[PDB]
Amino acid sequence: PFAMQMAYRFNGIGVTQNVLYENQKLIANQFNSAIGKIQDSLSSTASAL
Amino acid sequence: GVFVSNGTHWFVTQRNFYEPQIITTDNTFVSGNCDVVIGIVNNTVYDPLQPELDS
Amino acid sequence: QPELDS
Numbered sequence: 504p505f506a507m508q509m510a511y512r513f514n515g516i517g518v519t520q521n522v523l524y525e526n527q528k529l530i531a532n533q534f535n536s537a538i539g540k541i542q543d544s545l546s547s548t549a550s551a552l
Numbered sequence: 553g554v555f556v557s558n559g560t561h562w563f564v565t566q567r568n569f570y571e572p573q574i575i576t577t578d579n580t581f582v583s584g585n586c587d588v589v590i591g592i593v594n595n596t597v598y599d600p601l602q603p604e605l606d607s
Numbered sequence: 608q609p610e611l612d613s
């Protein structure tokens with residue numbers, strides 16, 4: 504499952520995994536906001552390519 | 553490791569080789585209450601100082 | 608063991 508995989512990637516940078524299971528909704532929200540920011544700094548005329 | 557179930561009982565195993573062992577307070581740690589984790593499961597954690605080693 | 612000999 505995906506949350507159990509995210510917990511191991513947290514464990515791999517030095518943070519424990521209860522930190523991910525406690526803050527799970529906040530982390531999922533921050534990821535969704537960052538993906539949405541990508542997709543409209545791409546749709547504008549900012550030439551990153 | 554990971555918590556796994558064989559259908560009836562619950563064990564703890566390492567990730568790249570299946571080798572199930574009994575969940576005691578030596579291979580787990582404690583943090584928090586049972587209402588924040590999404591998907592927590594009711595089982596029992598064995599205390600390895602109380603089989604008979606109460607003197 | 609050789610401390611919890613209560």
Ligand SMILES: *[C@@H]1O[C@H](CO)[C@@H](O[C@@H]2O[C@H](CO)[C@@H](O)[C@H](O)[C@H]2NC(C)=O)[C@H](O)[C@H]1NC(C)=O
Pocket residue numbers: 558559560561
């Ligand atoms: C799940 O694991 C438990 C523990 O290994 C199994 O219970 C054992 O079953 C064997 C039969 O082959 C008995 O000889 C043991 O005495 C049982 N252990 C205990 C502690 O009672 C259980 O059968 C397993 N279930 C499945 C579906 O594999």
Ligand SMILES: *[C@@H]1O[C@H](CO)[C@@H](O[C@@H]2O[C@H](CO)[C@@H](O)[C@H](O)[C@H]2NC(C)=O)[C@H](O)[C@H]1NC(C)=O
Pocket residue numbers: 594
């Ligand atoms: C996991 O275990 C706890 C108790 O160890 C369960 O909490 C009980 O839940 C029932 C119904 O939800 C209540 O009537 C009891 O009063 C609760 N006990 C306590 C001490 O508050 C919990 O529901 C269990 N979860 C599952 C999925 O079985």
Ligand SMILES: *[C@@H]1O[C@H](CO)[C@@H](O)[C@H](O)[C@H]1NC(C)=O
Pocket residue numbers: 590591592
């Ligand atoms: C798995 O999904 C079901 C819904 O299909 C849900 O009720 C259950 O809590 C989930 N188990 C987890 C997150 O461990």
